[PDB]
Ligand binder design. Structure first.
Ligand SMILES: COc1cc2c(Oc3ccc(NC(=O)C4(C(=O)Nc5ccc(F)cc5)CC4)cc3F)ccnc2cc1OCCCN1CCOCC1
Ligand SMILES: COc1cc2c(Oc3ccc(NC(=O)C4(C(=O)Nc5ccc(F)cc5)CC4)cc3F)ccnc2cc1OCCCN1CCOCC1
Lengths: 277, 279
């Protein structure tokens, strides 16, 4: 593996805080002793699990894109550290909570447009995410999005005649359509704070999703028709018919976006509310 | 038994023949130097370290599958970079090899015996949360007495993100997954009836799309076969996993519920044994 394995982290970085006590684990905010560059340290306690994590770092090492979090280093000492470029805005779900309101349609358009640039880049590299949500999209001071994982997702027998129908569908081109659906749900999440069927517990929602009709926004007046159309085309149960990331890029909902000013305003607004006391 | 890794197998067994040069590898016929109980030796040269680790887990799965209709594991050794698997010798051989040597398919009484014993085998595995996933005539061995011994040759197995942001297709893909073997079982009966599996004229790449797009297949010439035969195939070949019947349920079906004798299979083994002596 490429991971630097001969340095104890204390020389390079010093822990300075905790950003969230969370299910994924503890993640600290650190500054480099030499250059003082801000970053986030993901500290994990493991086995073969370490070998499972090693592929995760290599996936991110090759995902060099403006709208994807930048990895600065990885070290393994004192029984594995991950350094990620510090995004001062934080996750969008944390921002929505701090401001106690949903995103505006202009702000959603910017987020939607930048995520499709990220997904089109990932899918072209035969990489799926499978965990798209507001919590996985961080914000910078400049108003840009940096996509993140916060886990161990992101992927990438028998004889043919005697196989079953379910086996051909589940096992083996058109497997990228899952992220497109998750993106459509995230837009509704950022608009209405909570995702569809949030009253239910995780076990029941799975059955609830399959039988039910595709979800739509609650207040159809407030949002544009192109928003509703973009959601309707994105939220399609049939994978074969589901449009790719490239097709949605040429859609009026995001095709005419040239400025990130709307998102830049949000980060400054959320930054100010934090100081209130 | 646990795989011996410091004892050479040559001391224990002596090779006396080759049974098949195959995709899996070389398979020899062996005799125990002490007792001479006869066995089959599957010898594999593991390419990597994780290749070996996958195979040793497979052996441990078979070590716990103690059932009359499943091949018995006798020993496992790893010396000189090769992996040895010791299995009880089945004189009948695989039924697909039998069909070729006899140049004909099995009869409905012979299929009923095979079907009943396989339904007993699958019910035993599924109760232990084990799927097979590679059911075919080549994986069904035969004994002198007329009994079935199920085998793998390949590999079976014993047994993410947030749901709200999930799609419909992931919900289907991601404890009612045991029905796959039932489908492979229904196809194997057609194979033993018609020698060749369904859609054998097509190339292997095309078969995957044909299985899904087409409706479930049925037998070609039903005149020889019963409606009870046709119904059992039709009920087994159901696309929906939730609706597919389990192994215990198919046992309570007249096609195999009224079987008390394995004489039909015993006749098949004796016929094939005699044909070998010819030329
Ligand atoms: C929780 O708050 C924060 C978390 C941060 C952060 O977290 C991580 C994100 C992803 C990974 N991923 C990884 O380590 C990996 C990954 O994500 N791979 C990956 C895979 C596919 C892909 F498309 C993109 C990335 C697994 C490797 C690791 C992280 F540590 C990274 C960078 N800056 C952060 C800033 C945060 O708050 C700043 C604001 C704080 N204030 C807000 C206001 O109130 C007060 C607090
Ligand atoms: C090719 O001919 C033969 C092969 C034989 C044989 O092969 C194997 C079967 C399974 C495994 N499985 C394994 O190594 C494993 C397995 O099967 N596990 C498993 C897992 C789950 C399960 F449900 C069942 C089995 C992987 C461990 C390994 C084997 F080596 C086993 C026993 N007797 C055999 C007799 C053969 O011919 C006798 C007749 C010859 N005549 C033919 C006509 O002309 C004259 C000669």
């Amino acid at each position: 593996e490429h991971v630097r394995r001969d340095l104890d982290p204390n020389e390079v970085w010093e822990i300075v805080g905790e950003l969230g006590d969370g299910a994924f684990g503890k993640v600290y905010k650190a500054k480099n002793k030499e250059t003082g560059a801000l970053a986030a340290a993901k500290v994990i306690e493991t086995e073969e699990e370490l070998e499972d994590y090693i592929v995760e770092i290599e996936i991110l090492a090759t995902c060099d894109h403006p709208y994807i979090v930048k990895l600065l280093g990885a070290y393994y000492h004192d029984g594995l550290w991950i350094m990620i470029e510090f995004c001062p805005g934080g996750a969008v779900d944390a921002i929505m909570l701090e401001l106690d309101r949903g995103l505006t349609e202009p702000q959603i358009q910017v987020v939607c447009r930048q995520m499709l640039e990220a997904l089109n880049f990932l899918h072209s590299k035969r990489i799926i995410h499978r965990d798209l949500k507001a919590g996985n999209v961080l914000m910078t001071l400049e108003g840009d999005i940096r996509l993140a994982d916060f886990g161990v997702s992101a992927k990438n027998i028998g004889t043919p005649y005697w196989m079953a129908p379910e086996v051909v569908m589940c096992e083996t081109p058109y497997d990228y359509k899952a992220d497109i659906w998750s993106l459509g749900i995230t837009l509704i999440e950022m608009a209405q704070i909570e995702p569809p069927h949030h009253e239910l517990n995780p076990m029941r929602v799975l059955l609830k999703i399959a039988k039910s009709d595709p979800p739509t926004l609650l207040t159809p007046s407030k949002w544009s028709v192109e928003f509703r159309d973009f959601l309707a085309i994105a939220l399609d149960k049939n994978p074969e018919t589901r449009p790719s990331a490239a097709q949605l890029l040429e859609h009026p909902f995001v095709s005419s976006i040239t400025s990130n000013k709307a998102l830049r305003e949000l980060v400054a607004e959320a930054k100010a509310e934090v100081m209130e006391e």
